[PDB]
């Protein structure tokens, strides 16, 4: 669940892995941790995935409502200034490590919110279980004012470093660019090396020892 975030010369690139878990097993090999706050601002959070649902959808519509009240696009410091008002009252109830940021009237910001309520601006960060592995390769290859392609391979290596060097990670890696024009929901490096292919066994059709067949033909 390593989620990397950084800022390029004009946009912010996020990225994470699509593999949730329960502690000893794998939940699913594809669960897009990225989100859609609006057109010019995206979100990605770690921690418990249940509390992240009613913190993203709640923020998506509350920003959309505020976007329809005025006429301009929403600003990134308004939404972060609204989660803390709810996260403080749920200091031991709501727990989430959210990373979000997009283009607005100011530069491309990237805030990192803590479960207890702490939040501050950050030019590059990594949140999740294997966040330490993601921030490791990030601090060694982070130049200032890099191009979009210069940040695309960096966040790809930042997640790939958190894929092999961590247990609570895996699956594909999806990223997103949050430029002022539009967004991108690309899924590069979907590990197609294929070390070994499976062999599904389609069982034959004799019967399965069924005593009752209450078939119904409702339209």
Partner 1 sequence: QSMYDRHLTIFSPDGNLYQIEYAIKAVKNTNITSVGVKGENCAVIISQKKMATKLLDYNNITNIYNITDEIGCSMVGMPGDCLSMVYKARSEASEFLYSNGYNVNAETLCRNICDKIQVYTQHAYMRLHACSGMIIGIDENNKPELFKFDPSGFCAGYRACVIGNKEQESISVLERLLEKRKKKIQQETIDEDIRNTTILAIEALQTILAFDLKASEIEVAIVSTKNRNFTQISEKEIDNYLTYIA
Partner 2 sequence: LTTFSPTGKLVQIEYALNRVSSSSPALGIRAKNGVIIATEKKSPNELIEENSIFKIQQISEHIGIVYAGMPGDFRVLLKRARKEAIRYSLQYGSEILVKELVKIIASIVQEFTQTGGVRPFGLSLLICGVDVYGYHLYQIDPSGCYFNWMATCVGKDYQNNMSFLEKRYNKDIEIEDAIHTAILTLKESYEGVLNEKNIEIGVAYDNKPFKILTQNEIKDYLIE
Partner 3 sequence: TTIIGIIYDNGVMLACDSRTSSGTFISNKCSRKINRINENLYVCRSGASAHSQKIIEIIKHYCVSMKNENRKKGRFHEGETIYDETTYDFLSCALIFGGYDKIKKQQLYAVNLNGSIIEKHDFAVSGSGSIYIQSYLQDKYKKFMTKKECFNLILNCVKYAMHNDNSSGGLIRIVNITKSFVEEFTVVNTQMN
CB of 118 to partner 3, least distance (A): 5
CB of 151 to partner 2, least distance (A): 30
Does 65 bind partner 2 (CB under 8 A)? Our answer is: yes
114 binds, among partner 3, partner 1, partner 2, none (CB under 5 to 8 A by kind): partner 3
Three-class secondary structure of residue 50 per DSSP: helix
CB of 40 to partner 2, least distance (A): 15
Contacts of 135 (CB under 8 A, 6+ apart): 4, 124, 125, 126, 158
Give one DSSP letter per residue of 63-108, joined into a string.
HHHHHHHSSSPP-HHHHHHHHHHHHTTTTTT--EEEEEEE-SSS--
Does 30 bind partner 3 (CB under 8 A)? Our answer is: no
179 catalytic? Reply is: no
Tell which residue, 148, 133, 136, 132, has the closest CA to residue 8: 148
Question: What are the catalytic residues?
Answer: 1
Where along the sequence are the contacts to partner 2 (CB under 8 A)?
Answer: 57-58, 61-62, 64-65, 68-69, 71
Where along the sequence are the contacts to partner 3 (CB under 8 A)?
Answer: 81, 84, 88, 91, 112, 114, 116-120, 122, 125, 132
Where along the sequence are the contacts to partner 1 (CB under 8 A)?
Answer: 66, 69-70, 72, 75, 77-78, 80-82, 85, 105
């Amino acid at each position: 669940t390593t989620i990397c975030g950084l800022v390029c010369q004009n946009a912010v690139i996020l990225g994470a892995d699509t593999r949730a878990t329960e502690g000893p097993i794998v939940a699913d090999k594809n669960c897009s941790k990225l989100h859609y706050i609006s057109k010019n601002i995206w979100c990605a959070g770690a921690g418990v995935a249940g509390d992240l649902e009613h913190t993203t959808l709640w923020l998506q519509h509350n920003v959309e409502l505020h976007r329809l009240n005025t006429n301009t696009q929403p600003r990134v410091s308004m939404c972060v200034s609204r989660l803390t008002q709810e996260l403080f009252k749920y200091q031991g109830y709501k727990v989430c490590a959210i990373v979000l940021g997009g283009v607005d009237v100011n530069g491309p910001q990237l805030y990192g919110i803590h479960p207890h309520g702490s939040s501050c601006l950050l030019p590059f960060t990594a949140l999740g279980s294997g966040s330490l592995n993601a921030m490791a390769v990030l601090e060694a290859k982070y130049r200032d004012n890099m191009t979009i392609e210069e940040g695309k391979n960096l966040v790809c290596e930042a997640i790939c470093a958190g894929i092999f060097n961590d247990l609570g990670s895996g699956g594909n890696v999806d990223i997103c660019v949050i430029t002022k024009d539009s967004y991108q929901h690309i899924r590069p490096y979907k590990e197609p090396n294929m070390r070994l292919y499976h062999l599904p066994h389609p069982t034959i059709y004799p019967k399965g020892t069924t005593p009752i067949l209450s078939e119904k033909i409702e339209y």
